[PDB]
Amino acid sequence: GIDYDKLIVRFGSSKIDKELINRIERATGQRPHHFLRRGIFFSHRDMNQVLDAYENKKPFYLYTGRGPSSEAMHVGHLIPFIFTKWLQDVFNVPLVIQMTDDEKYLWKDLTLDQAYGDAVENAKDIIACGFDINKTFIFSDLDYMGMSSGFYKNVVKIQKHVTFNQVKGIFGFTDSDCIGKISFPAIQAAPSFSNSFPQIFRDRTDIQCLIPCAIDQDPYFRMTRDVAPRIGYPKPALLHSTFFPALQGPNSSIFLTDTAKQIKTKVNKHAFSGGRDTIEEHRQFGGNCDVDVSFMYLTFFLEDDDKLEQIRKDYTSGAMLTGELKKALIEVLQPLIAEHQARRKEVTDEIVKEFMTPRKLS
Amino acid sequence: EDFVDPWTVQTSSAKGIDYDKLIVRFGSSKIDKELINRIERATGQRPHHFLRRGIFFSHRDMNQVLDAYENKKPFYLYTGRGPSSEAMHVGHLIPFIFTKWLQDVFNVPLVIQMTDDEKYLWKDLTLDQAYGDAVENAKDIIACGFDINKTFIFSDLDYMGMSSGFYKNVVKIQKHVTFNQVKGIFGFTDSDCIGKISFPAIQAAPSFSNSFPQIFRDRTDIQCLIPCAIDQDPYFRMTRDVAPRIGYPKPALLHSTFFPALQGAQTKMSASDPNSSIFLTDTAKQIKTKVNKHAFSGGRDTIEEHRQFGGNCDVDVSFMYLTFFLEDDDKLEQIRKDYTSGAMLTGELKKALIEVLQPLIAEHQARRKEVTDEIVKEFMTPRKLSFD
Numbered sequence: 137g138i139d140y141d142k143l144i145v146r147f148g149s150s151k152i153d154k155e156l157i158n159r160i161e162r163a164t165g166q167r168p169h170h171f172l173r174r175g176i177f178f179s180h181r182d183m184n185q186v187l188d189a190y191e192n193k194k195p196f197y198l199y200t201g202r203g204p205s206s207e208a209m210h211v212g213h214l215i216p217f218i219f220t221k222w223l224q225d226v227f228n229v230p231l232v233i234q235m236t237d238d239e240k241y242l243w244k245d246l247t248l249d250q251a252y253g254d255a256v257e258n259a260k261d262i263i264a265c266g267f268d269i270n271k272t273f274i275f276s277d278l279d280y281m282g283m284s285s286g287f288y289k290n291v292v293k294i295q296k297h298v299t300f301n302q303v304k305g306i307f308g309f310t311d312s313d314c315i316g317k318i319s320f321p322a323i324q325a326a327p328s329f330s331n332s333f334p335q336i337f338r339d340r341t342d343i344q345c346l347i348p349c350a351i352d353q354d355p356y357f358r359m360t361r362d363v364a365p366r367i368g369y370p371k372p373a374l375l376h377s378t379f380f381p382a383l384q385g386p387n388s389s390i391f392l393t394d395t396a397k398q399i400k401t402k403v404n405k406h407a408f409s410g411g412r413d414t415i416e417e418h419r420q421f422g423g424n425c426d427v428d429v430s431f432m433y434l435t436f437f438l439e440d441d442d443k444l445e446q447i448r449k450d451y452t453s454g455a456m457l458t459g460e461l462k463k464a465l466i467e468v469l470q471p472l473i474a475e476h477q478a479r480r481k482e483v484t485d486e487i488v489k490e491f492m493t494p495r496k497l498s
Numbered sequence: 499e500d501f502v503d504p505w506t507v508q509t510s511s512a513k514g515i516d517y518d519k520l521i522v523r524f525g526s527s528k529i530d531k532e533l534i535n536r537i538e539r540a541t542g543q544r545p546h547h548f549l550r551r552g553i554f555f556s557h558r559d560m561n562q563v564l565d566a567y568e569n570k571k572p573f574y575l576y577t578g579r580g581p582s583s584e585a586m587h588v589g590h591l592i593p594f595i596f597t598k599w600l601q602d603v604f605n606v607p608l609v610i611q612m613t614d615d616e617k618y619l620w621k622d623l624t625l626d627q628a629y630g631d632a633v634e635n636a637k638d639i640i641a642c643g644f645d646i647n648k649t650f651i652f653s654d655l656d657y658m659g660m661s662s663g664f665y666k667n668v669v670k671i672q673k674h675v676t677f678n679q680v681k682g683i684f685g686f687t688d689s690d691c692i693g694k695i696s697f698p699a700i701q702a703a704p705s706f707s708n709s710f711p712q713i714f715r716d717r718t719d720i721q722c723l724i725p726c727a728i729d730q731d732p733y734f735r736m737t738r739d740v741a742p743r744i745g746y747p748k749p750a751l752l753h754s755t756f757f758p759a760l761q762g763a764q765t766k767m768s769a770s771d772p773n774s775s776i777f778l779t780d781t782a783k784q785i786k787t788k789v790n791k792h793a794f795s796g797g798r799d800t801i802e803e804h805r806q807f808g809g810n811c812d813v814d815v816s817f818m819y820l821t822f823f824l825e826d827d828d829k830l831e832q833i834r835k836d837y838t839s840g841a842m843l844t845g846e847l848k849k850a851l852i853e854v855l856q857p858l859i860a861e862h863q864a865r866r867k868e869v870t871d872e873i874v875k876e877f878m879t880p881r882k883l884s885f886d
């Protein structure tokens with residue numbers, strides 16, 4: 137029992153209600169994604185503003201990012217992108233994806249070239265998620281900073297309105313930290329304003345931003361929202377989601393690089409079970425879907441609501457065993473991961489380059 | 499002890515800051531005769547008076563610059579200025595005159611940084627206001643006669659967004675300097691904006707050749723020489739320790755003393771002060787007026803006294819100004835000896851100075867008028883220079 141209602145108030149966000157979900161549905165003319173109608177993406181901030189702009193034929197855009205990783209990207213990392221891809225499709229709005237290679241360089245043991253390299257590679261995985269090349273700008277901080285007539289200006293503006301004491305509290309920086317880490321929050325914030333991308337929005341500063349993110353990141357995004365009116369820009373809207381369960385609750389998680397046999401082995405051997413120790417005692421008391429990692433993953437990926445609920449009931453009653461549940465998950469992940477690998481393999485250096493080239497979108 | 503940093507120059511001494519002593523504190527090298535000669539031979543020209551008179555008395559690795567030069571290996575100059583709305587006085591000319599001379603005798607490329615972003619961060623203006631001041635000051639800079647074909651003047655706000663190498667070097671430098679370190683060097687506090695805290699990386703960046711691909715392609719081995727009053731040393735003592743950590747050569751330095759304030763050599767000429775400066779905008783009348791009515795005097799209070807005791811050149815601002823702008827050495831020594839003897843009276847010894855400063859300020863004001871927008875724009879345009 138995690139409890140997210142104690143978080144909506146802890147941060148001051150606005151819990152998304154069955155009422156808000158309906159306006160989205162009416163505005164998009166499509167059934168709400170399962171993350172919504174399942175509470176994956178529960179809370180938000182200013183979502184109604186976005187709809188106001190949209191319904192009244194006024195465009196808005198999406199912003200999300202990732203810290204280029206030299207390591208593997210697991211299924212958990214897909215949640216944000218899947219939702220953003222959906223938002224992008226149903227609203228048909230531009231999307232900018234920031235690869236914070238400068239950030240990784242500042243925090244990890246990498247040369248500037250290696251950081252950039254990890255960014256271009258992670259870019260393939262992101263493109264693999266299926267984003268439309270005609271309305272998605274994926275950019276490396278290291279590359280785009282030197283080719284934007286608006287980005288650095290916004291960074292300087294933000295840097296002037298944020299003090300060390302403020303970032304010390306929000307991010308825990310110390311006196312021993314390099315000056316690059318200390319001013320980085322401005323780089324991460326700048327993408328929230330439309331005129332940071334002249335090639336896409338030009339001089340416009342009204343096209344509001346929408347940022348899908350994790351609930352426990354709301355404090356960080358508060359900095360950006362607080363600086364917005366201070367420098368004359370609309371605050372970016374937010375859509376919060378729950379956390380992704382850890383495997384145990386190496387084999388730390390299921391990476392998008394694992395094979396069918398690897399997935400199978402990870403689940404059946406490491407997926408934390410909320411079921412009983414013996415098959416006799418399990419049918420006796422049932423399983424706990426609340427803490428059963430295997431079922432939790434199903435809530436994220438299994439798209440059939442009925443098929444999902446049926447599993448919850450059976451596992452809870454004790455009818456379905458753990459190994460059987462694990463088989464239900466493995467049969468959903470293998471094709472998930474499999475398809476990702478296929479799409480990624482078809483992403484050429486040409487395609488990557490086009491996604492990462494500042495240009496007019498549609 | 500004296501106090502000099504990128505923002506303030508204070509001393510309880512009339513004879514000004516104690517150089518040869520600041521050389522130790524800052525840990526630098528004295529420019530000796532041997533070096534002066536080496537520069538004469540390498541350039542086939544007479545050493546500028548700043549060197550001849552000890553105006554530029556300190557250096558860092560000038561010998562490495564010469565080693566390279568004498569071996570057909572290029573090098574470039576870098577200096578800059580924080581744009582202002584009304585500033586830009588005579589004292590400012592010192593590093594720009596010397597830089598211009600270095601550019602002409604060595605015939606090397608030069609980049610000049612206008613820190614409009616620094617001003618935007620430390621002042622209370624808008625981006626457009628900061629950039630505006632950058633352009634205006636560019637006119638004054640160009641007026642010193644820098645060769646358009648070998649000089650790149652750039653606004654940080656503008657160049658940062660159009661350089662495939664500037665920002666990457668900012669980031670590199672940023673990783674190798676701690677808040678703690680910038681606290682000790684520049685005295686920043688936890689209350690300052692993050693922009694101020696990381697700014698030192700932006701001023702260090704021009705010290706490296708690949709920050710300017712349009713000029714040096716992708717070469718990282720082009721030695722850099724930074725002529726600057728010694729008040730800009732902090733930025734570069736920091737930059738020098740960082741250089742090898744990011745695989746670049748350390749920038750060389752040539753330190754100039756401070757142009758005394760009208761009221762006295764206790765501070766450097768500062769536009770931030772009421773009437774301690776002779777601005778490059780002052781009319782011929784304002785110049786003589788400020789010299790007579792404000793230029794501190796080292797000559798006895800009265801003529802009788804002056805005749806018997808003489809005058810102190812070490813503290814007379816008028817004479818100090820002459821060591822900077824009176825080109826003729828013998829004439830300078832004659833004025834020195836006569837003022838020291840009493841033969842010459844404080845009585846418009848200032849006249850001599852006024853005869854020097856008036857044409858000086860006038861020549862600049864004139865050349866400044868010739869600065870067209872097509873001109874400023876060409877200077878501030880990233881482009882290949884007259885080299886390879």
Ligand SMILES: Nc1ncnc2c1ncn2[C@@H]1O[C@H](COP(=O)(O)OC(=O)[C@@H](N)Cc2c[nH]c3ccccc23)[C@@H](O)[C@H]1O
Nearest residue numbers: 577578579580589590592593611726727730756757766767
């Ligand atoms: N009273 C004085 N007497 C003699 N020289 C003086 C006096 N006051 C100023 N200077 C010199 O003038 C140059 C510009 O000063 P700034 O304060 O604009 O300079 C600034 O505020 C820097 N952030 C701009 C900068 C960027 N890169 C550089 C590289 C070298 C030197 C300067 C820069 C400087 O060379 C300075 O030493």
